[PDB]
mmCIF file with all atom_site columns, C-alpha atoms (C1' of nucleotides) in Angstrom:
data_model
loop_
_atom_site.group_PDB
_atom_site.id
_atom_site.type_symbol
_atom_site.label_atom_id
_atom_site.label_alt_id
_atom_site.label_comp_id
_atom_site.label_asym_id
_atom_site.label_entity_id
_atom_site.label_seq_id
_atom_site.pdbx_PDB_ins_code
_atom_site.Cartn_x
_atom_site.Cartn_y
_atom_site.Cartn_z
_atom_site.occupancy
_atom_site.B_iso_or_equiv
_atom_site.pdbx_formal_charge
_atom_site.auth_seq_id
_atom_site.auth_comp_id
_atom_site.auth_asym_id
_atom_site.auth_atom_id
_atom_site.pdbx_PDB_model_num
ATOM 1   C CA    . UNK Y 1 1   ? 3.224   -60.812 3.757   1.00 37.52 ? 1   UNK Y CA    1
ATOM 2   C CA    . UNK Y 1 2   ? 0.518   -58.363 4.607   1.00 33.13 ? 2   UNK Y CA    1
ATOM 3   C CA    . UNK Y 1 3   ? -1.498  -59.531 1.482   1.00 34.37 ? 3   UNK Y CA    1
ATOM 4   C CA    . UNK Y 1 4   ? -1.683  -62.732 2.238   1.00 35.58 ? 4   UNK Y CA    1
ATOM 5   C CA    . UNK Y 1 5   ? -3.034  -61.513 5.945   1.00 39.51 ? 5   UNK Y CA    1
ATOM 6   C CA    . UNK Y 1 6   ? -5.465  -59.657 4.483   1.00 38.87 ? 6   UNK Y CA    1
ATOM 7   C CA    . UNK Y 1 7   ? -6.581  -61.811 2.262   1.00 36.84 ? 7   UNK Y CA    1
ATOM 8   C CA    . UNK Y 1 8   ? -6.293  -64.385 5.359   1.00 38.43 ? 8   UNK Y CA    1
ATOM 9   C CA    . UNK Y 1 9   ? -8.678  -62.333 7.502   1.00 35.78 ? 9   UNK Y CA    1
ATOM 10  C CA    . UNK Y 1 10  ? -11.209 -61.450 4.622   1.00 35.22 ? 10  UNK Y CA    1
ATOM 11  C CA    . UNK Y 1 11  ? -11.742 -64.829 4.222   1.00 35.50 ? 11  UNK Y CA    1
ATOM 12  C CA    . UNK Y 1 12  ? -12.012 -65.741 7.944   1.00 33.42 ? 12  UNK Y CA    1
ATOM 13  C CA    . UNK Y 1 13  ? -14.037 -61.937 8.399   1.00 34.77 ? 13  UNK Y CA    1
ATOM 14  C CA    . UNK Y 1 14  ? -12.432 -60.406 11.265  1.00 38.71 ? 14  UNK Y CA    1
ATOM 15  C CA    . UNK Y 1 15  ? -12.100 -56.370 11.852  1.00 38.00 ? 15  UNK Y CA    1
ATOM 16  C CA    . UNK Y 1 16  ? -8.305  -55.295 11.764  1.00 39.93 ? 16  UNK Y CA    1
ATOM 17  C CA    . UNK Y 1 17  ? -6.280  -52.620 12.840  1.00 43.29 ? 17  UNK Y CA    1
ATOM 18  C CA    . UNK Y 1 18  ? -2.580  -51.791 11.144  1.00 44.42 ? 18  UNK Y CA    1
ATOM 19  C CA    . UNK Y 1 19  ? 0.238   -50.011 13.109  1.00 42.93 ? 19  UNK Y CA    1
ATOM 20  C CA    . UNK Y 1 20  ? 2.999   -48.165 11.308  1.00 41.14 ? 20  UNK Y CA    1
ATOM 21  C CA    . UNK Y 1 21  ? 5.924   -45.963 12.428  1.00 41.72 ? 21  UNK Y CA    1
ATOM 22  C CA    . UNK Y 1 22  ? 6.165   -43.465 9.064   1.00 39.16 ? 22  UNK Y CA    1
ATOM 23  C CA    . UNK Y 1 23  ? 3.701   -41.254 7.800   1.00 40.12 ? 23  UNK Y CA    1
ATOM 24  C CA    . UNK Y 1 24  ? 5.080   -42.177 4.410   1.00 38.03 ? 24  UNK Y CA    1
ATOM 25  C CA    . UNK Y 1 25  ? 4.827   -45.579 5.193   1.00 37.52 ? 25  UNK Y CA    1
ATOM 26  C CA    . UNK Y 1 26  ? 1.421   -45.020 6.087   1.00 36.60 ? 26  UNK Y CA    1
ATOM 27  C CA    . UNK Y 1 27  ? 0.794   -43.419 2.535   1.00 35.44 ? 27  UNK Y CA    1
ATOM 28  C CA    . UNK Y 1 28  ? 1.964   -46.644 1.215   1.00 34.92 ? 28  UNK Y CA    1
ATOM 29  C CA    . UNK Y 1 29  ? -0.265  -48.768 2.988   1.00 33.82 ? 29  UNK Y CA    1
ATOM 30  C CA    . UNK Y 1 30  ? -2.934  -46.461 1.904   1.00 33.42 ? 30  UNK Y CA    1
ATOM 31  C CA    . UNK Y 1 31  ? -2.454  -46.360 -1.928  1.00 32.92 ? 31  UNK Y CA    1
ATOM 32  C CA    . UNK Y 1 32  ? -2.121  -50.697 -1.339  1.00 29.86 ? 32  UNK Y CA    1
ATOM 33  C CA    . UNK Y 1 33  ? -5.061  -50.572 0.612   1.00 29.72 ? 33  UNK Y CA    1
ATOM 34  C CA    . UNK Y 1 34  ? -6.894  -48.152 -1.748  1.00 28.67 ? 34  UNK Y CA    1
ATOM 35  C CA    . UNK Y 1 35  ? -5.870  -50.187 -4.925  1.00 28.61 ? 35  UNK Y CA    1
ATOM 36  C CA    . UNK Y 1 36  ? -6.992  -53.267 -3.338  1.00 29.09 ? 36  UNK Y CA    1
ATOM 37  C CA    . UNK Y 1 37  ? -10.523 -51.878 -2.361  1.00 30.74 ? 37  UNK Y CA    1
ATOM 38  C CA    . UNK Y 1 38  ? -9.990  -53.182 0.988   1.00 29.85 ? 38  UNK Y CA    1
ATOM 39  C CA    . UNK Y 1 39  ? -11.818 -49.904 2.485   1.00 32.01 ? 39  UNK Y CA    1
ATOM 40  C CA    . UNK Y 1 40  ? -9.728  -47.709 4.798   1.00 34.60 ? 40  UNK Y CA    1
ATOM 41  C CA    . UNK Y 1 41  ? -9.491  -44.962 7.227   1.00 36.20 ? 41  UNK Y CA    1
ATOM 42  C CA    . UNK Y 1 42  ? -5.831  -43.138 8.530   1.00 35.29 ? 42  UNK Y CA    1
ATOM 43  C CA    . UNK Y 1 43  ? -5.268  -41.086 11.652  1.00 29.92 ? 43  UNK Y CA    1
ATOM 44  C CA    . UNK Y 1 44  ? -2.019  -39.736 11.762  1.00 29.12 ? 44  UNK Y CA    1
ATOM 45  C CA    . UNK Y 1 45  ? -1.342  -37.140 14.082  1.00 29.64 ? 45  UNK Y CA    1
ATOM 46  C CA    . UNK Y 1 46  ? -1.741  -34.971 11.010  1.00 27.68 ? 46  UNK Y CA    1
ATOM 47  C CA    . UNK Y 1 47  ? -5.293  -35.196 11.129  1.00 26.14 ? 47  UNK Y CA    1
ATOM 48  C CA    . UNK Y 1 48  ? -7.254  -32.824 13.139  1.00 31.35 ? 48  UNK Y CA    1
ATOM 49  C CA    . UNK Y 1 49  ? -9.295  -33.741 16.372  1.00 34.70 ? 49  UNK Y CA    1
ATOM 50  C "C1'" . DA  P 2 1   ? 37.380  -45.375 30.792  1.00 36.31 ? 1   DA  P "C1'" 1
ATOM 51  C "C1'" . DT  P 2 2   ? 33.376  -43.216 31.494  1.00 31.28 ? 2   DT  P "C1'" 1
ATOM 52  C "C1'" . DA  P 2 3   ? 29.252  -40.177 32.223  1.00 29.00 ? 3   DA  P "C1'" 1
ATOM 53  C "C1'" . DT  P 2 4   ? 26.493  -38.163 28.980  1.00 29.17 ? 4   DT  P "C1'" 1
ATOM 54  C "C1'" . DC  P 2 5   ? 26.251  -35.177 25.278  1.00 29.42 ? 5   DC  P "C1'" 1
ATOM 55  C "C1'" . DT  P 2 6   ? 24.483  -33.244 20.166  1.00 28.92 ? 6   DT  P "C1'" 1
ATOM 56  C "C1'" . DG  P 2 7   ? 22.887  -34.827 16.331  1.00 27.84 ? 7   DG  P "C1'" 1
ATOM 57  C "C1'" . DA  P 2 8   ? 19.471  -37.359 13.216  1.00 26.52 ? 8   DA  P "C1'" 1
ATOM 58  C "C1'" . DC  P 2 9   ? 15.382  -37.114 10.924  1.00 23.28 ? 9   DC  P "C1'" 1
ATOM 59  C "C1'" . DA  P 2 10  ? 11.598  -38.635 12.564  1.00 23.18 ? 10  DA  P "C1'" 1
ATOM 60  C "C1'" . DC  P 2 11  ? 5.535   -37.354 13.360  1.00 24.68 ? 11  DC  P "C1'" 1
ATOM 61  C "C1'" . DG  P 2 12  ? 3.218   -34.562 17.514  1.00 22.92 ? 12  DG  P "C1'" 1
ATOM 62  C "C1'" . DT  P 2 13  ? -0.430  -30.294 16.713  1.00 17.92 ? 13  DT  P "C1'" 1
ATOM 63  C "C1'" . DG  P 2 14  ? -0.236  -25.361 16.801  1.00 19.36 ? 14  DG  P "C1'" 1
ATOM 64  C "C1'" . DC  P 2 15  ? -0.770  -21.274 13.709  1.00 18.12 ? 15  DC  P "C1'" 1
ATOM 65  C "C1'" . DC  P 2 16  ? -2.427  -19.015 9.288   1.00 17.61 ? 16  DC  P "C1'" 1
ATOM 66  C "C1'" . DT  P 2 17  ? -2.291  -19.108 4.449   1.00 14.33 ? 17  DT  P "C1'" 1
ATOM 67  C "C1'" . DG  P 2 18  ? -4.508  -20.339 0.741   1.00 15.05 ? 18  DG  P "C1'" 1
ATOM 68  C "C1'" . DG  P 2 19  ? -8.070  -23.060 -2.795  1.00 16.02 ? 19  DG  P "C1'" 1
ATOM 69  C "C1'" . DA  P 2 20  ? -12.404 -24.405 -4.726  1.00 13.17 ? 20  DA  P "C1'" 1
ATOM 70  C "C1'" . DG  P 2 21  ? -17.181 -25.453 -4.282  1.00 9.57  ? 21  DG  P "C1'" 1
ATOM 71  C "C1'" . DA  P 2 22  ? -22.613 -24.140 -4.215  1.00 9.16  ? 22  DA  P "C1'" 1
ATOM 72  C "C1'" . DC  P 2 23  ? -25.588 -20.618 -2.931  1.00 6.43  ? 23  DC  P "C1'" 1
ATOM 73  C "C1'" . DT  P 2 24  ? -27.906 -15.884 -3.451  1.00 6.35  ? 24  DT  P "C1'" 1
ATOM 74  C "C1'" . DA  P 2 25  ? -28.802 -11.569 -5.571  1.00 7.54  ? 25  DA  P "C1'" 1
ATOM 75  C "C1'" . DG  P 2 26  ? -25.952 -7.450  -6.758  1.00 6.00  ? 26  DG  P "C1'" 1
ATOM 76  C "C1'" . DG  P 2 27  ? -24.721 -5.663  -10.838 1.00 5.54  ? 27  DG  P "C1'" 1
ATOM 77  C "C1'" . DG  P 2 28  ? -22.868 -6.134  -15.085 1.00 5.24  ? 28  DG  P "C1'" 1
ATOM 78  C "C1'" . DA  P 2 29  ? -23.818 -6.415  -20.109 1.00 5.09  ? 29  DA  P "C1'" 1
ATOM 79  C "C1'" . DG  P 2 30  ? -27.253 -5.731  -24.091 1.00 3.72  ? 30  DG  P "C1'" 1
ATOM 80  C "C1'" . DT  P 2 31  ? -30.410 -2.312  -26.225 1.00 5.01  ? 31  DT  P "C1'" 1
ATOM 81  C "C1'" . DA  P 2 32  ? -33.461 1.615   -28.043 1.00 4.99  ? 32  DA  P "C1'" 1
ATOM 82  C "C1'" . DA  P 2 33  ? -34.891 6.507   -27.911 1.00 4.97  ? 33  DA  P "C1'" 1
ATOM 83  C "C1'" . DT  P 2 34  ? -33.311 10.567  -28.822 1.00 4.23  ? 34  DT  P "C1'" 1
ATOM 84  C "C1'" . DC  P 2 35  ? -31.054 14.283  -27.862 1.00 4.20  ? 35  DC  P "C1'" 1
ATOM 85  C "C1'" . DC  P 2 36  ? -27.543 17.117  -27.836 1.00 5.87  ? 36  DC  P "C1'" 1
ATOM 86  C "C1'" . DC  P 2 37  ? -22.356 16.951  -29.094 1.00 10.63 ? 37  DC  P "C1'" 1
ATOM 87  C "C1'" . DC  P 2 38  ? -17.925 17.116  -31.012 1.00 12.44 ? 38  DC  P "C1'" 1
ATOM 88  C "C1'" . DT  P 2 39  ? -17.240 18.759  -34.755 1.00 11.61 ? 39  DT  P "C1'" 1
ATOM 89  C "C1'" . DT  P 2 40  ? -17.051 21.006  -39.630 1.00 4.44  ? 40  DT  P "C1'" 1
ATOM 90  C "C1'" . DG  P 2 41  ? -16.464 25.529  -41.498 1.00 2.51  ? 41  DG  P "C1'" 1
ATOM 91  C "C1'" . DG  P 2 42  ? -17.198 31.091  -43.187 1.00 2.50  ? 42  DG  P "C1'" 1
ATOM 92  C "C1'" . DC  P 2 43  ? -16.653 35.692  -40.856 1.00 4.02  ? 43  DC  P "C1'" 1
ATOM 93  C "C1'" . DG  P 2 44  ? -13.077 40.463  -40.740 1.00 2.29  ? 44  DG  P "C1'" 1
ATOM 94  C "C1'" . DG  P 2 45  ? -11.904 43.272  -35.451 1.00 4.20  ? 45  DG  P "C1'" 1
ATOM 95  C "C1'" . DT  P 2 46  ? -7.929  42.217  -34.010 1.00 2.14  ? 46  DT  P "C1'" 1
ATOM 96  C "C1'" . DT  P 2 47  ? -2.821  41.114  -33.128 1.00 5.46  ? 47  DT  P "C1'" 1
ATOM 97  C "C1'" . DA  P 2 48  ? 1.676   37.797  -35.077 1.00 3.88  ? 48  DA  P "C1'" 1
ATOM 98  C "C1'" . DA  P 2 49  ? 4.937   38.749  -38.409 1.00 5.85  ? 49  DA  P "C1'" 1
ATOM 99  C "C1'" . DA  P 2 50  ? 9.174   41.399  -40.012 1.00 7.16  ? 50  DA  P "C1'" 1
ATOM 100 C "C1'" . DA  P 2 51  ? 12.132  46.130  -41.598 1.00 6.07  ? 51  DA  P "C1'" 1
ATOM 101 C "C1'" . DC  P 2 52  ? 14.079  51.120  -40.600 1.00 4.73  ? 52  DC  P "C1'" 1
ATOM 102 C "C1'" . DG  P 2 53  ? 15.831  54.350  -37.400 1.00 4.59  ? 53  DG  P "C1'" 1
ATOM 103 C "C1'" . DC  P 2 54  ? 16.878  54.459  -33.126 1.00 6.75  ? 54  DC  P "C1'" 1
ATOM 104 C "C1'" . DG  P 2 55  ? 17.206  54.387  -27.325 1.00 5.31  ? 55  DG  P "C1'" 1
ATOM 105 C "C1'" . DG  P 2 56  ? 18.679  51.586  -23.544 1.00 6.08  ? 56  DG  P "C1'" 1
ATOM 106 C "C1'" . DG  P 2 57  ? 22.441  49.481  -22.078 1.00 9.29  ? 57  DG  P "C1'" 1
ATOM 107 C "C1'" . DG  P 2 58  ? 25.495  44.895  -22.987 1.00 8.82  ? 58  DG  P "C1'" 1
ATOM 108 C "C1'" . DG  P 2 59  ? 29.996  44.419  -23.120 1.00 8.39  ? 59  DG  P "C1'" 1
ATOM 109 C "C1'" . DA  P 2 60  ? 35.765  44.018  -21.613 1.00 9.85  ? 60  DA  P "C1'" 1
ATOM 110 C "C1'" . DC  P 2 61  ? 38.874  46.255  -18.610 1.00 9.61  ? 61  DC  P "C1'" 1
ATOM 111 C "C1'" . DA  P 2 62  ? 42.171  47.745  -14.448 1.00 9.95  ? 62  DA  P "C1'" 1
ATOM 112 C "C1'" . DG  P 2 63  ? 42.748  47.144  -9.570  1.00 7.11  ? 63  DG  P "C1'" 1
ATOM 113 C "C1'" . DC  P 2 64  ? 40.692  48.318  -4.751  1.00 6.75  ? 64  DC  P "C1'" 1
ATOM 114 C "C1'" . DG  P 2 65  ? 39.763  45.905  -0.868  1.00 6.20  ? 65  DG  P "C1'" 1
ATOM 115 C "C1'" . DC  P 2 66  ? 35.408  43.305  3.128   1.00 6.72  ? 66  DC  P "C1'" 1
ATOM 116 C "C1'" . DG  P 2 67  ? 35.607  38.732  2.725   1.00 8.22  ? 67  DG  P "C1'" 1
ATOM 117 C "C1'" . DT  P 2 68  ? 36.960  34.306  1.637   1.00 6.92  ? 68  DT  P "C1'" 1
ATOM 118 C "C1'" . DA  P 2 69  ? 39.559  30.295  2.153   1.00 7.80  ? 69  DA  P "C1'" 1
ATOM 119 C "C1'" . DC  P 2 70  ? 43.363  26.708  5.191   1.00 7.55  ? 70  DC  P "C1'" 1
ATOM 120 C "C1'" . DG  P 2 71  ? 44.230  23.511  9.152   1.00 12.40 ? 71  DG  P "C1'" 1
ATOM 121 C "C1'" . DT  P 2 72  ? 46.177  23.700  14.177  1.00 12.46 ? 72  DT  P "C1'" 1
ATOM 122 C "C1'" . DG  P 2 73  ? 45.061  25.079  19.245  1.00 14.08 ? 73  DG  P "C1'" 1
ATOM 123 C "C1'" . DC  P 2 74  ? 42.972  23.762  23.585  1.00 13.22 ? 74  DC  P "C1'" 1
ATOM 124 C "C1'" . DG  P 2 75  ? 38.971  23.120  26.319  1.00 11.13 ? 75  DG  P "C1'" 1
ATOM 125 C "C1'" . DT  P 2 76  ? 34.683  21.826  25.572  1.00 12.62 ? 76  DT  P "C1'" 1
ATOM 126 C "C1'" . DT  P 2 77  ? 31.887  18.165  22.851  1.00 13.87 ? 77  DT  P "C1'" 1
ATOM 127 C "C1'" . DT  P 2 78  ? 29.566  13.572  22.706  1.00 15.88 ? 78  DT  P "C1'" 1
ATOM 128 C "C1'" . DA  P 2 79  ? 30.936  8.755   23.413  1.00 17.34 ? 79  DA  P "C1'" 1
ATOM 129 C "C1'" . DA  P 2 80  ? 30.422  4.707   26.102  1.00 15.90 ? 80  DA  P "C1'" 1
ATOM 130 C "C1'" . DG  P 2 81  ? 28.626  0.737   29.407  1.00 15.50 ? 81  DG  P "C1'" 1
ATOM 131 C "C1'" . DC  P 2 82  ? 25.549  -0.838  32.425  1.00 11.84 ? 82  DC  P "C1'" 1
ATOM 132 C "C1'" . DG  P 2 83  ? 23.214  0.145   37.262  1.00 9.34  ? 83  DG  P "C1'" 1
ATOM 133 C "C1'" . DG  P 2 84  ? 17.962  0.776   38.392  1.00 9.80  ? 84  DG  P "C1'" 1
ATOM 134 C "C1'" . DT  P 2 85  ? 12.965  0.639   37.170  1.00 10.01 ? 85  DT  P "C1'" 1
ATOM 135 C "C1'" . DG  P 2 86  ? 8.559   3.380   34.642  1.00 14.19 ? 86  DG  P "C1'" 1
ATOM 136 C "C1'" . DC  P 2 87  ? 7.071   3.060   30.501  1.00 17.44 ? 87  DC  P "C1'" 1
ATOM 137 C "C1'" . DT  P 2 88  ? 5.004   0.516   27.308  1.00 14.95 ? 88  DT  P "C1'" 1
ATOM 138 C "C1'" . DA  P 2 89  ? 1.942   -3.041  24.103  1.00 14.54 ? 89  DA  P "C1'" 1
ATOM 139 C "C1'" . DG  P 2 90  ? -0.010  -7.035  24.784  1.00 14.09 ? 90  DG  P "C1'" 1
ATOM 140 C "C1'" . DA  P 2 91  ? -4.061  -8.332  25.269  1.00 14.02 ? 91  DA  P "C1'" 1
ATOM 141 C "C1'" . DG  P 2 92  ? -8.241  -9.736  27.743  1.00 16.00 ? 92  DG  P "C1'" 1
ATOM 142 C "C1'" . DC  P 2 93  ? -12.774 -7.650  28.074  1.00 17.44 ? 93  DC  P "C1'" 1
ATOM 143 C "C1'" . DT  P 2 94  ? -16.066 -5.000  28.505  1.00 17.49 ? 94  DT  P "C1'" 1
ATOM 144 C "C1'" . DG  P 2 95  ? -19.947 -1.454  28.063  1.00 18.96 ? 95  DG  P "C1'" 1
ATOM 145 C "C1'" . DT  P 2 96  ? -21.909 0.799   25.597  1.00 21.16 ? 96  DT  P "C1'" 1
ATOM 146 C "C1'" . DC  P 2 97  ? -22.522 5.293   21.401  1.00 21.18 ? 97  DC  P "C1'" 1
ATOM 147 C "C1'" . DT  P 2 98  ? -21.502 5.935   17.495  1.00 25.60 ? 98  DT  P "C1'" 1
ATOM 148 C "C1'" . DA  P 2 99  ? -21.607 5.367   12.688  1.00 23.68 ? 99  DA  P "C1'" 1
ATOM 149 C "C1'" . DC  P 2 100 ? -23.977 2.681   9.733   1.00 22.88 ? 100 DC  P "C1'" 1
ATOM 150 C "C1'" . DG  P 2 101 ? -28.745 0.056   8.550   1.00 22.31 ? 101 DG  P "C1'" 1
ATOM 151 C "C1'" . DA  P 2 102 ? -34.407 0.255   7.775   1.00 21.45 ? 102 DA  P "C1'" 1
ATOM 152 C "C1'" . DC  P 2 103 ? -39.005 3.164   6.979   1.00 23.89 ? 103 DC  P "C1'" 1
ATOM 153 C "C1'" . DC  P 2 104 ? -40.721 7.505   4.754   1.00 25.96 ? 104 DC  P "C1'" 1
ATOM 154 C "C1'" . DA  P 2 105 ? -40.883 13.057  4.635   1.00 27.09 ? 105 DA  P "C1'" 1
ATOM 155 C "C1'" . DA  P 2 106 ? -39.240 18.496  1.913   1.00 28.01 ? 106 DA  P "C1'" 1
ATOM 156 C "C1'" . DT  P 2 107 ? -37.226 19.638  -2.094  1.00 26.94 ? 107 DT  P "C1'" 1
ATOM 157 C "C1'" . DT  P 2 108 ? -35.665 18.937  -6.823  1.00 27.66 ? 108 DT  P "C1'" 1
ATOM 158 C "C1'" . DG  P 2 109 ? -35.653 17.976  -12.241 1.00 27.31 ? 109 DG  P "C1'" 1
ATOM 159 C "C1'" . DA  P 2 110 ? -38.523 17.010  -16.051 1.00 28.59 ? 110 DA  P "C1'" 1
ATOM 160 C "C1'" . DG  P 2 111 ? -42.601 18.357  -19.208 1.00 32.09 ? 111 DG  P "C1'" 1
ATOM 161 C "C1'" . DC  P 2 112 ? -44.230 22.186  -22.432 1.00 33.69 ? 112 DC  P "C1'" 1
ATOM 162 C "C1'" . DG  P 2 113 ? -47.156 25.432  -22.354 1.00 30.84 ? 113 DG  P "C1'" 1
#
DNA sequence: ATATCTGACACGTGCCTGGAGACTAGGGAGTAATCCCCTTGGCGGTTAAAACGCGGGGGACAGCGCGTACGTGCGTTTAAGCGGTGCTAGAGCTGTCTACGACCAATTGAGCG
């Protein structure tokens, strides 16, 4: 569902922010994101200030 | 029955440990020149080596006796907790002086006459 989103609001070319709960889910959304060239960024509170 | 508790279970940032990248420039690795060394090897004043004849004393008893062992008495030993509360390291910060850097003199080793 979040492909089809993205691929959505490419087309249409509006800026988007994604929530997630997990750290690991975050990873997972990365290595999508990363695969799919979409360019990213991640903050998790991992990340220093 | 109910209030609310003790996991479930996770991402918050702290700390420091711990890795790899790009730089200088300290110093390691490559080399002759050449000397001076570890090493080979004959020389005879000096002591390892073993008898004979021999001196110093090692050796095996008998038993006396100045000390040594057991293991309980009894009064002196440390144990023991937990009161107060001064010491004690943390640690935050100077406030410099002290040992370690930067520029160049008295004294030394090398050259051979």
């Amino acid at each position: 569902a979040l492909d089809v989103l993205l691929t959505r609001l490419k087309s249409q070319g509006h800026r988007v922010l994604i929530y997630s709960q997990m750290t690991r889910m975050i990873d997972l959304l990365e290595e999508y994101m990363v695969y799919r060239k979409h360019t990213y960024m991640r903050l998790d509170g991992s990340s220093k200030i």
